Design an enzyme around this catalytic site. Structure first.
Site, PDB file in Angstrom:
ATOM      1  N   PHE A 150      30.949   8.055   3.305  1.00 17.88           N
ATOM      2  CA  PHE A 150      29.803   8.478   3.744  1.00 17.88           C
ATOM      3  C   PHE A 150      29.817   8.236   5.028  1.00 17.88           C
ATOM      4  CE2 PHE A 150      25.221   7.384   2.798  1.00 17.88           C
ATOM      5  CZ  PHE A 150      24.640   7.131   4.260  1.00 17.88           C
ATOM      6  N   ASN A 175      47.765   0.059   8.908  1.00 12.86           N
ATOM      7  CA  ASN A 175      47.563   1.401   8.685  1.00 12.86           C
ATOM      8  C   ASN A 175      46.224   2.125   9.000  1.00 12.86           C
ATOM      9  OD1 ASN A 175      47.659   4.391   7.334  1.00 12.86           O
ATOM     10  ND2 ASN A 175      49.518   3.981   8.229  1.00 12.86           N
ATOM     11  N   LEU A 193      22.955  12.287   8.573  1.00  8.48           N
ATOM     12  CA  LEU A 193      23.322  13.341   9.594  1.00  8.48           C
ATOM     13  C   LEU A 193      22.554  14.675   9.292  1.00  8.48           C
ATOM     14  CD1 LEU A 193      25.208  14.595  12.085  1.00  8.48           C
ATOM     15  CD2 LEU A 193      26.593  15.397  10.176  1.00  8.48           C
ATOM     16  N   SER A 199      47.188   5.288   4.019  1.00  6.67           N
ATOM     17  CA  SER A 199      46.396   4.304   3.822  1.00  6.67           C
ATOM     18  C   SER A 199      46.087   4.408   2.338  1.00  6.67           C
ATOM     19  CB  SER A 199      45.095   4.152   4.649  1.00  6.67           C
ATOM     20  OG  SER A 199      45.502   4.052   6.061  1.00  6.67           O
ATOM     21  N   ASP A 231      23.577   9.636  16.685  1.00  7.02           N
ATOM     22  CA  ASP A 231      24.435   8.877  15.927  1.00  7.02           C
ATOM     23  C   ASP A 231      25.654   8.677  17.106  1.00  7.02           C
ATOM     24  OD1 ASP A 231      26.487  10.860  13.940  1.00  7.02           O
ATOM     25  OD2 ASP A 231      26.658  10.835  15.922  1.00  7.02           O
ATOM     26  N   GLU A 259      24.648   1.152   9.065  1.00 12.62           N
ATOM     27  CA  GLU A 259      24.108   2.204   9.635  1.00 12.62           C
ATOM     28  C   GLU A 259      22.631   2.006  10.210  1.00 12.62           C
ATOM     29  OE1 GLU A 259      26.937   5.144   8.577  1.00 12.62           O
ATOM     30  OE2 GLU A 259      25.370   5.114   9.881  1.00 12.62           O
TER      31      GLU A 259
END
Ligand SMILES: [Cl-]
Ligand SMILES: [Cl-]
Length: 162
Positions: A104, A132, A32, A117, A20, A11
């Site tokens: 996250f 996948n 965010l 998945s 972002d 990040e």
């Protein structure tokens, strides 16, 4: 390496409001603020989040405080979620970190959408889950990050981060 160091790599840290990868107002370590096009809406979410009049800038302590809360929230959303919780409980400690990273980034609802998945991860079919996981908007929009997270699920080691 741990979840905090992993996410700090993925990040980055910025002390002033920024957009972002999707174009949304964000601050700190991927915190965010708002999906709204308005920098004024962002500044006001930011003041509310920090509890003071920030004018779009925060300190390092404040960034790290939001980060801690966001990691905590990511974990608590996994454990409250009927699709994610059984997958998390089945995983070793390193792969748990990979799941947290995904939540996250994209939220509990987004990850719960990786139905196939998640089932492969639960069954420990690592190479198949990795294939996948890659067939996703996530992988095509942020390939370097997604590759590091996918490698972590595939190998159960921190090698993509060292
Ligand atoms: Cl907050
Ligand atoms: Cl990326």
């Amino acid at each position: 390496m741990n979840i905090f160091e992993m996410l700090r790599i993925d990040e980055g840290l910025r002390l002033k409001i920024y957009k972002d990868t999707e174009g949304y107002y964000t601050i700190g370590i991927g915190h965010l603020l708002t999906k709204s096009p308005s920098l004024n809406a962002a500044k006001s979410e930011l003041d509310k989040a920090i509890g003071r009049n920030t004018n779009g800038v925060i300190t390092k302590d404040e960034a790290e405080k939001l980060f801690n809360q966001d990691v905590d929230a990511a974990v608590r959303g996994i454990l409250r979620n009927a699709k994610l919780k059984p997958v998390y409980d089945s995983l070793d400690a390193v792969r748990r970190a990979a799941l947290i990273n995904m939540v996250f980034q994209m939220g509990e609802t987004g990850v719960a959408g990786f139905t196939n998945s998640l089932r492969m991860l639960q069954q420990k079919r690592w190479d198949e889950a990795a294939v996948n996981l890659a067939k996703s908007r996530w992988y095509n929009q942020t390939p370097n990050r997604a590759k590091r997270v996918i490698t972590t699920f595939r190998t159960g080691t921190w090698d993509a981060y060292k």
